[PDB]
Every structure is written in structure tokens, then in C-alpha cells.
Design a protein around this ligand. Structure first.
Ligand SMILES: Nc1ncnc2c1ncn2[C@@H]1O[C@H](CSSC[C@H]2O[C@@H](n3cnc4c(N)ncnc43)[C@H](O)[C@@H]2O)[C@@H](O)[C@H]1O
Ligand SMILES: Nc1ncnc2c1ncn2[C@@H]1O[C@H](CSSC[C@H]2O[C@@H](n3cnc4c(N)ncnc43)[C@H](O)[C@@H]2O)[C@@H](O)[C@H]1O
Ligand SMILES: Nc1ncnc2c1ncn2[C@@H]1O[C@H](CSSC[C@H]2O[C@@H](n3cnc4c(N)ncnc43)[C@H](O)[C@@H]2O)[C@@H](O)[C@H]1O
Ligand SMILES: Nc1ncnc2c1ncn2[C@@H]1O[C@H](CSSC[C@H]2O[C@@H](n3cnc4c(N)ncnc43)[C@H](O)[C@@H]2O)[C@@H](O)[C@H]1O
Lengths: 264, 264, 264, 264
């Protein structure tokens, strides 16, 4: 099987990568970072996020695996001391695949424009180019609210433990095909009104943000953050595409949440 | 078709009920409150909740409809001025059914006990008999947290706009088969830790609350509130059963939320 | 100096108490639990709260000191291993007094009634006798809001780290003469509106709760919880009375908060 | 008395300004925008904020008054229809002054640097230059927390109804000499910990933010927002300076809050 390994790039991660490559050299098992079937990430969630975005045009063909050199691995699965066991198990094909939902973001411009389309594993957020942030929120073509505040965050299920959590969003099991919209510092008074609460949308629901003033927005997709000018619409929906993980052993999502927030 | 009508019991609702009965007398269309196929509720959500609990052993056989004499009808569908049109449409069978998920609550006791089982359309909550409230939260047999605070609330999707909302929970579209757990005044310090965030569980996930001290709890199921003694376990899961609504015309959930919280 | 010692009542606290009494026997320093000038509490904050309420008619004459046998001493000052040093320092009168604000609660009834008056070190809360909870909130005689929800909590500055904190209230330095009002699960929709936010009131401001329906309320004052019937008014204001602590050494409030919530 | 009038600059505000000037021409009462004793602002709170910052070196000599051409006047006092009555009352000197606390912000740099000092009527906030935001929070020289998240907001009492409110802060009566610190999207997990809660500081307490990485910050002071490079420290304290308002008639702060958030 073709595989590749991304590293965080510190001494620890590089040496671990070299050892795994040497270990894989005893099997079959070819290193290929153009068309890999397995992508191993060694580092933290940031490294894992970069690996995902490196290969987003090949998601249907790849199973991802993370080794964490932290603290903190929501997309790890593995400790560095377990790397030899992982080489062994991965070479023997002793694994069942697990899929998580992804978020599609479409950014439509004026003139042309595009139509830029992005895929997120954690979330996409929108803020002003600074700038009061004011947008009309449209759900399946019905005007829902005029949002005023700092910005909005649209999260995948696996993303709910990240930025979503800090904003008061719910944690959602990744078997649920949904996206969740949270507010950043909404303004609520006698004249300005928002829902307040996070909103959880099923597949096929479309959430559209339309400028009120002010057509310039800072848009993030996971780690990536870009200033978009002359925006006519930002559009969110659950992607038809999914990320596939290689597992290996039981490590339930709720235990992962327990280990990350309660105690380990 | 067999039908019945529950009324809130004020002059407005009773007279509306009598007129609808008279209107149904011109069709076929028999009044039967033992084995109805259609249950019409005239009042508010409280009246609707009582109608549901009146007929919870016949949920597979009944389509529910609500007329609101409020303000505030999340389970209405209809205004009193539209009652004649509703009589007409309901008699002609001009409707498609919509189903919403329900919550199963199991309360297990010591000695015997039971095993009391309840069905909720909005939510089930647990508080102490007063009493510090302390429970172990167990998700699919793994210990997740020791919760200390005022209590816990487990909501259906349609329930998310009710008690769940007041506690900071997410609003969830009712096409999603899930339940949501929210905290009431959790204690968080260096020694006591809870997740903080609401938690959204898919079908087949089981959330179990187990007493730490203190085996006496005040348990609510929608409007019903009962003191249970000598509790060994409280168990939550998405019910296999569903409530069926008769519709009639498009009134999307998100528009219902808009009309109820933003403006109408 | 006259002193007394309350104990939590477990083996640890009782023996510590006996040793301190023996230690005080070597000074002057008379044990008197009728008219003490120093009240030592050995246990947790619960023990300390009971000691305070034991002597609330003598607050102007007493300096309080807490030794914690926890984890968790917001009203401790002292570890059990330091008890000998404390005996020594307290006998020599090597201490400056620190005062914290208190909360006055007045409960007015119908017929008669009373006028029951309570003093709180942490907070007073109000909930329904169960029961939807609905009250009119009146600030300095102006109608501010109709509150619907689970209840309300009025906290002292030192109380802000307790129930207040769990409800989303601000932590306030105890040098500020104020009280803070927080909501429990407020209902907010198109027809029902509350402020949402915690409210911080200075000295001489009066907050009055007046029944809308329903004149029966469960009222807590620190650990004490009582069902009051036929209530006409519940009235809150910063007390003219203060609790005095004996200190001893610098242990700033913010460090106390750090040690209790961040790390120790 | 010397006075000046700032206008929002739309037709409505300019004409109102011209009429008030004409009205003041019948008294004594000289227009002077260099050394005014009365500053009238016609517009919204933004206009009022600009008027304040226009004259921040003369705060001890000026009484401010606002007329609102909104909706929304927390620093208005007056409707446009009342402008004639205001001209009359202001000319006769029929007013008592009211003072509100202000926030001092000190920004210290490396090399030199400065020491930039700012005065805020609403708040000062800090965010990264984008950028993960990580700062050490130091209260009166004791390390309190390492904050990770979007940013921090330090509010005056009158500022608590603004940005502070959106971030979950308490509303504080402006007779209380304090500042309030709120979090923007704090990260809390097993390894990263913040207090969560808003913090209310008395006069003479000093809150210092010290960079961990990353010495570049976007700092706001009311409407003003500036990118500061090579920051060594950001320092907050309640200013010795106060804003003085001219009043005129009773319009209590809590009624102002009611009118702005509940109903008018
Ligand atoms: N999925 C997930 N769950 C929990 N924690 C995560 C996750 N993904 C990344 N992280 C953690 O984010 C940290 C930096 S990853 S860089 C990009 C991510 O940063 C996250 N981010 C950005 N601002 C915030 C704030 N303010 N709060 C929480 N998370 C934030 C956002 O989700 C982005 O996708 C690091 O501690 C990771 O362990
Ligand atoms: N599904 C739904 N959404 C929104 N609002 C609802 C819903 N069901 C009922 N209600 C409203 O609850 C009010 C009384 S119904 S009696 C039983 C329900 O009360 C609700 N309850 C109890 N305490 C609270 C609090 N504290 N906050 C919000 N809701 C609460 C809970 O969901 C129970 O199921 C009335 O205004 C109804 O319009
Ligand atoms: N002042 C203060 N700060 C922090 N923690 C405190 C304080 N006073 C007591 N406690 C802690 O409350 C716990 C039980 S004391 S019994 C009475 C107090 O319970 C508190 N209480 C009741 N329900 C709650 C909830 N739901 N959350 C937080 N605190 C609560 C309330 O403040 C009462 O005054 C124990 O861990 C103490 O260390
Ligand atoms: N003091 C006060 N209370 C309530 N509302 C206020 C106040 N001052 C200004 N405003 C309102 O802020 C709006 C724009 S003023 S421009 C500068 C202020 O914007 C405020 N701001 C910036 N971002 C936010 C967010 N996200 N939420 C609330 N307020 C925000 C912040 O307090 C700044 O001082 C307008 O509706 C004013 O009526």
C-alpha cells in the first residue's frame, strides 16, 4: 500500500517519521506523497489539519491516521511509543475505516467571481475586514435574522470540540451528519435581535450569509484565513465528501472528549 | 375518520371546539376519544403536551394537530380564525404526515422496582429532592463525568426551543434523530469538573445517570414532575417511537423558530 | 480574649479542635461560645457558613477565622498543619481585621406577617414552590422586568465565586460594596423578555421581587432553605452589617480565586 | 457659558444643531469649540464617543449632553423634539452634574516606546494581529492565568451595556468605581485553563497583560482601533479622571437599561 508521512518538523516528529519509514521498509508498503492511500500525520491537530488540506482532492482514496507529540490529539489516535505497533498493524491491513462529515463553504463574488469553494474539517468562520460585522442569515431561502456582532462560526461534528466549544456550541457525535452555527459576541437590544443559541442543521439545509453594507469579509477555513473582497454571498452546507480514518482499536468519541476536557 | 378534540378549557377554546365538532358533523368524521386517528388540540403547547400524553400508547395510529389560542404555538400549526379551513382540509384528507423524534426515560429502583419508563416530547430533567445534586454520567457504559450542580436536562429536537434553550442548549432541526443533554448551574473548580457544553447524542447511544449519595430525585417528563425514591439508575435514549403531525401546508421549523423568537 | 471553635465533626476536625483548645490553655484566652470575640471554624466552607449564622447577632464583636480540612476553603485562610502557628499568632494579637459586605433579605407576607429578615454571606435565592416561577423585578421602585424561568440569585461579593459563578455571574472583589443578581434558566422569546445579563447593584439600591401569581416561594439564604407562603414581597439590599475576618498574613482575594479555580 | 455642538452630519442632525445655535444666540452663551464648558452631541452613541475623545484633555472643565437621532442613546438624555426645552434649561443653568468612571489603558513597548496612554468611556479590547492570541494575565503583580482565545475586553461601568454585555459580562451601576474584564472565546481543556467568568476590579487594582509569543496586538479604545507592534505590557486601571454629564431631570441608569433592552 502507498503511504506518506507529514511531520510537525521538530526533532521529535522528524526522527519518529524516519523510524516509521525504516519500519515500513520491511513490508510492502511504498512511500508515495503524490497518490498515497494512507496519510500519517505526526505532530498535533494543526499538523493533521495541514495533512487533510494537502490531500483534499483525494479524500475518497485516503485513510488518515494521527500520532500526537502533544498533549492534545483529537485527530490522534496514537502516542509516539506506539509507533512500532502502528507500523505493524498498518502493514497487515488490520483496520476498519471510520468516516466523519465535512463542511462545504461557497464564496460568491460580484463581477467575476467565482464561486470559491472550500472544504473544512473543523470549521469556517466569517468576520468583518474591520468593520462592524452585519449580515443577513438566510436558511433554505427564508430570511432568519439580521446578525450584528463579531462574526459567525460554522462547525462540523468533529469541529464542535474546537472553536465551536469556546463560543458556547454543543458537542455533537460525528456519526450525525450536520453542521452547527454559533455566534461571536452578538448584539441584542430593543432594536437588534439574534437567536442567541447555537443552531444545528441537517444535511441538505443551506445557510447563506448576505452582506448588508460592507461586502469585505475575513473568512477562515480551519487554519487558513483569507480576506475576500466584493462578496455577494457566503454559503454553507454539509459536504457530500467525508474524511476517512484508519482504526485499529476502539477509542470512542465520548472517551476522546473525556480524555481531552475532563481528565487523562 | 375518527377524531377527538382537547380544549384548554377557557371560553375561547371550548366554543372553538364546539364549532369544529359541528363542522365535522357535516362530514364523515366520527368523534371518538378512545381510539381516535386524529387528535386536535386547542390551547397552547401545554394543552398539546397533555393531548400527547393522553394518547402515548397509540402514537403509531394518531396524527396530531394544534390550534393556538396564544401567543406561542410551537406545536401549533393553526390560528383560531383558520379553524373552518382546517375542518374542511382534514375531512378531505388533504395532508402529508411529519414525524418528530421522542425521548425514552427509564428509571430503575432498588428492591423492586421497576423500571418505570416514560416518553417525552420536550424533555426529561433530573434534580435532587433538595439535596445537593451529584450524579455520575455514564455514556455507553464509559464513565464520562461526575456532575455536581442543580440538575440535568435531556431534550428532544423539538424540545430544544424550550427548557433546553434557556439552559444554553443548541436548537436542532427535528429531522435529526438525537437527544441533547444540558447542565443546570454546574460547579467547576480545581477539584470538580464537568464538560460545561451541551452534548448531542445520536440514536442508540445510551446516557445513564447513577447516584453518588443520595438516591432520591425529582424527575420531570414534560409537564409531569415526580419524586422518585431509592433510584439506582436513570437511563436516556432516543425512542424507537415517534410523534406524527398532520400537515397541510409548508411551515418550516426554522420559520417557526423565527416567528417565535425573532419577530412575527 | 474569649474564643470558640466549631468543628465539622469528623475525627480530623475534632482532634484539631481539641489540640487548639489545649494550645490556647497555655495563654489567656478563655473558651466562651456565648460571647466569643474570635470564632474559629474547622472544616469546609459549610462549617464556616454555620459558624457565621450561629453568631449573626454578634457580627460587630467577632473576628472569624477558618481552617480547611478540604480541599476548598474560600473562607479558610489556614491548613491543619499550621494550627499551632495560628494558636501562637492569635494569642499574641498579631492580626489586622478585614471586612466583607453582606446581603440583607426581607420577606414580607400577607395578613401577618412579617417581615422576616435574613443575612447572607454567600447568597439568597428564590425559586417557586414548584410551580412556574414568575416575578416582577422592581429596582428602586421602577418596574424593570417580568422574570420567568427557574429562579433568581442575589450574591454578595465573596459569594460571587459560589452559586453566582455557576449561573454565569461576574467575580467581584470584596472591597466593592455591592450585590449581584443572576438569572436561573430565563425564558426569552418574542413575548417574554428578561435582561439576560447579571446585574450589579451598589449600596442603597433596593431590588424587590413581587409575585405575579403564585405567592409561594422556596427561599434560600446560604445553606438554609425555607418554603415561604403568602409572600407579598422579597426585598434585597446591601446590609449595613459586615463580617470581620482576622488576618494574619497576605492572601489576596485574586490569589484565593487563582488557587481555587486555576491551580494550586 | 461657552459651548459647542458636534453633529452626526446627516440632514436631521445638522439642522437641529443650527436651530440650537440660533436658540443659544438669544442667551449668553458663546459658541467656542476650543475651550467649551458644555459639549452637546447630536447623533448616536458613536457621535457622543467622538465628542468625548475630541475633548479628553479638558474633561475636568466640561459637562457633556447627548441628543439622540436614533433609536439607541445610552449617552443621550434627549430626543430631538426636546431641543428647545434643552436650550432653555441649559441657558438658565438649571442642572446638577453626574460623573461616571473611566478606564486608563497604558501600552508599554520595547526599545522606545512609550508608554502610550489611552482613556476609554466604554472599553478597551485586545486581540492578536492574527495570530493565535496568548497572554499572561497579572493582577496586582500576581500571575493569575495564561489566557488563550480570541481576546479580552476591559469595560467601564457605563461600558457594561456595550461590548461587555455581548461577551456575557455583568451590567454595573456607574456609581461603582470599577472596571470589568471579559473573555472572548477562551480555550478551556485539560491543559489550558482560564477563569471563564467576568472579573470586576475596584479602583487601584492593576491588571497587566504580558505577551507570551507574539508581541503584536490589535488594541481598541472605544471606536479607535490600532495595531501596536513590539508590546511588552498592556496595563489597565480605573482612571483618576471622570466624565461629567449635565442633568436636568431624573433618568436613572436602570430605567435607561430597561428602555434600551426590555421595552420603550
Ligand atoms: N477538533 C478539535 N477539537 C479540539 N481541539 C482542537 C481541534 N482541532 C484543533 N484543536 C486545537 O486547536 C489548537 C490550535 S489548531 S490551529 C486551527 C484551529 O484553531 C481553532 N481555534 C481558533 N480560535 C479558537 C478559539 N478561540 N477557541 C478554540 N479554538 C480556536 C479552530 O478550531 C481552528 O480549526 C490546538 O490546541 C489544537 O489541539
Ligand atoms: N417545544 C417548545 N418550544 C418552545 N416553547 C415551548 C415548547 N413547549 C412548550 N413551550 C412553552 O413553555 C411554556 C409552558 S409549557 S409547561 C411544560 C414545559 O415548560 C418548559 N419549561 C420549564 N421550565 C422552563 C424554563 N426555565 N425555561 C424554558 N422552558 C421551561 C419545559 O420545556 C416543559 O416541557 C409556554 O410558554 C409554552 O409555549
Ligand atoms: N464563597 C464560596 N466560593 C466558592 N465556593 C464556595 C463558597 N462557599 C461555599 N462554597 C462551596 O460550596 C460547596 C457546598 S457549601 S453549602 C451552601 C452553598 O452551596 C452553594 N451552591 C448551591 N448550589 C450551587 C450550585 N449549583 N453551584 C455552585 N454553588 C452552589 C451556595 O453558594 C451555598 O451558599 C462546597 O464545595 C464549598 O466549598
Ligand atoms: N454604552 C453603550 N451601551 C450600549 N450600547 C452602546 C454603548 N455605546 C455604544 N453603544 C452602541 O454600539 C453601537 C456602535 S458604537 S461604535 C464603538 C462601540 O461599539 C461597541 N461594540 C463593538 N463590537 C461590539 C459587539 N460585538 N457587541 C456589542 N458592542 C460592540 C463597543 O462598545 C464600542 O465602544 C451602536 O448601536 C451604539 O448604540
Amino acid at each position: 500500500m502507498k503511504y506518506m508521512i507529514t511531520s510537525k518538523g521538530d526533532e521529535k516528529s522528524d526522527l519518529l517519521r524516519l523510524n516509521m519509514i525504516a519500519g515500513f521498509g520491511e513490508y510492502d508498503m511504498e512511500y508515495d506523497d503524490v497518490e498515497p492511500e494512507i496519510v500519517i500525520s505526526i505532530g498535533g491537530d494543526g499538523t493533521f489539519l495541514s495533512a487533510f488540506h494537502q490531500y483534499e482532492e483525494r479524500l475518497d482514496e485516503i485513510a488518515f491516521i494521527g500520532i500526537h507529540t502533544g498533549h492534545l490529539g483529537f485527530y490522534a489516535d496514537w502516542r509516539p511509543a506506539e509507533a512500532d505497533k502502528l507500523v505493524k498493524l498498518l502493514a497487515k491491513g488490520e483496520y476498519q475505516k471510520v468516516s466523519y462529515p465535512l463542511l462545504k463553504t461557497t464564496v460568491k463574488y460580484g463581477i467575476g467571481k467565482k464561486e470559491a469553494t472550500y472544504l473544512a474539517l473543523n470549521e469556517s468562520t466569517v468576520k468583518s475586514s474591520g468593520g462592524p460585522f452585519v449580515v443577513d442569515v438566510v436558511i433554505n431561502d427564508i430570511h432568519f435574522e439580521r446578525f450584528r456582532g463579531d462574526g459567525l462560526c460554522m462547525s462540523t461534528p468533529s469541529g464542535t470540540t474546537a472553536y465551536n466549544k469556546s463560543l458556547g456550541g454543543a458537542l455533537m457525535h460525528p456519526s450525525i451528519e450536520a453542521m452547527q452555527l454559533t455566534e461571536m459576541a452578538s448584539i441584542n437590544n430593543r432594536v437588534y435581535r439574534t437567536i442567541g443559541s447555537p443552531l444545528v442543521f441537517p444535511k441538505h439545509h443551506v445557510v447563506s450569509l448576505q452582506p448588508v453594507n460592507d461586502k469585505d469579509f475575513q473568512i477562515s477555513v480551519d487554519h487558513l484565513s483569507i480576506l475576500h473582497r466584493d462578496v455577494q454571498e457566503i454559503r454553507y452546507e454539509v459536504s457530500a465528501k467525508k474524511i476517512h480514518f484508519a482504526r485499529f482499536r476502539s477509542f470512542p468519541f465520548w472517551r476522546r472528549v473525556h480524555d481531552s476536557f475532563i481528565e487523562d
